[PDB]
């Protein structure tokens, strides 16, 4: 079973360095060309660098040539990408990828990919989220349905985890992808729909945990009795 | 230098139907074309290379054809695991990828439940005000949300995000958040979220008046 595993990703500030590793098993590593490819939600997949059978035989994309360095250590079945002078726009998921490497038939195609390691480049400082209630309003359909939630605002970096009533309430919850605000800090909402008059009685707790800042919050959400 | 343009951006189909995905190159790439599949939180997977060569272990329902500038990936009969994002990739000149076609589950039209939430009191003493609008369990995914402060359309001050397609009812939910300073929040009193969606006969508006 061919396997590729990337490590080394993390949070770093603009202008700093980072080095990614990619461990290979289940095939004869030194017989294959190897690549680094990154992906962002905004502009998709972008090829970055290739190293071929000879370890001094490399090419790079324009946007990283001279700042990043691809290398391989075949005695350790490991591929590396040295990332210098990082910019905020280097934020991406970084994939290790094997080239099909069929000299006679096909090459420069990616027949196996790793799991990816996440690289976040940002001036921001780790900050736990403020948690504000999204209160079930008192103008909703009696004998009907109501929505409530928690706004998990201004934290960094990803991720946070959110549960309701310690996990005993999952049905009807939507936890939204975080958005990056222009502050450079993330914000996220988590909502749940429940029937309308079980509002004035039933207790609803959102359990927010942001492990980078060691912020754990259980926020009680209650009706606004206008 | 060579741009790959994929269409459609989203394809909505059911298990068993034929899927046809297109990739167009801005200049000829001969046969130097590959297709990849990627599911959320997973890496891409090689399906086809050299335009029509099926990669090892890829089921026979996947096939590739084309040459020059115009290519197609066909899935002859869709299985539930086939719902995913698909990318083409060129290696005629350097290496570039298309922007992807997303393959999603077709279902009946469903209207969004719309809820609006004023900023919490605890947030207002911090000095900022966020209004949240929720569109819950709608289909299709296309929907337009517009904020009106004192019945004036807002612009450039809100962000939204959308859930992945629900794996049991195949709907989407969308959360949209309006960020204002409290000082400009206190200038105005009605705040409204108007949502337009195929499932609503005419745009729906959910609102509140500040201080209630």
């Amino acid at each position: 079973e061919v396997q590729l595993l990337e490590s080394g990703g993390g949070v770093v500030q603009p202008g700093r360095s980072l080095r990614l590793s990619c461990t290979a098993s289940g095939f004869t590593f030194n017989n294959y060309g190897m690549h680094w490819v990154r992906q962002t939600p905004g502009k998709g997949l972008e090829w970055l660098a290739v190293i071929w059978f000879d370890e001094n035989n490399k090419y790079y994309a324009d946007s990283v040539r001279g700042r990043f360095t691809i290398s391989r250590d075949n005695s350790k079945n490991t591929l590396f990408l040295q990332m210098n002078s990082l910019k905020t726009e280097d934020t991406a998921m970084y994939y290790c990828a094997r080239d099909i490497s069929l000299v006679r038939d096909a090459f420069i195609y990616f027949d196996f990919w790793g799991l990816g390691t996440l690289v976040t480049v940002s001036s921001a400082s780790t900050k736990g989220p403020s948690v504000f209630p999204l209160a079930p309003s008192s103008k909703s359909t009696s004998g009907g349905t109501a929505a409530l939630g928690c706004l998990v605002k201004d934290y960094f970096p990803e991720p946070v985890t959110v549960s309701w009533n310690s996990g005993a309430l999952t049905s009807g919850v939507h936890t939204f992808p975080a958005v990056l605000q222009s502050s450079g800090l993330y914000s996220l909402s988590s909502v749940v729909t429940v029937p309308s008059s079980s509002l004035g009685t039933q207790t609803y707790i959102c359990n927010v945990n942001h492990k980078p800042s060691n912020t754990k919050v259980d926020k009680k959400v209650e009706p606004k009795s206008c | 230098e060579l741009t790959l343009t994929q269409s459609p951006a989203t394809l909505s189909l059911s298990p068993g139907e034929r899927a046809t995905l297109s990739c167009r190159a801005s200049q000829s790439v001969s046969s130097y074309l590959a297709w990849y599949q990627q599911k959320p939180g997973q890496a891409p997977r090689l399906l086809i290379y050299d335009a029509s060569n099926r990669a090892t272990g890829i089921p026979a329902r996947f096939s590739g054809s084309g040459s020059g500038t115009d290519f197609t990936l066909t899935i002859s009969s869709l299985e539930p695991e086939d719902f995913a994002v698909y990318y083409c990739q060129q290696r005629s000149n350097w290496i570039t990828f298309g922007q992807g076609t997303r393959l999603e589950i077709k279902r009946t039209v469903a209207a969004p439940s719309v809820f609006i939430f004023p900023p919490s009191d605890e947030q207002l003493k911090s000095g900022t005000a966020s209004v949240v609008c929720l569109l819950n369990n709608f289909y299709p995914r296309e929907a337009k949300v517009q904020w009106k402060v004192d019945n004036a359309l807002q612009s450039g001050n809100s962000q939204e995000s959308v859930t992945e397609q629900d794996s049991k009812d195949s709907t989407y939910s969308l959360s949209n958040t309006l960020t204002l300073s409290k000082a400009d929040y206190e200038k105005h009193k009605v705040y409204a979220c108007e949502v337009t969606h195929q499932g609503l006969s005419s745009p729906v508006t959910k609102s509140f008046n500040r201080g209630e």
Binding site: D54, Y59, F107 | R91
Partner: peptide, 15 residues
Amino acid sequence: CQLINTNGSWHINCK
């Protein structure tokens, strides 16, 4: 074998 890029075009040369 050496992997060659010439103005974007790929080829492998083997001696």
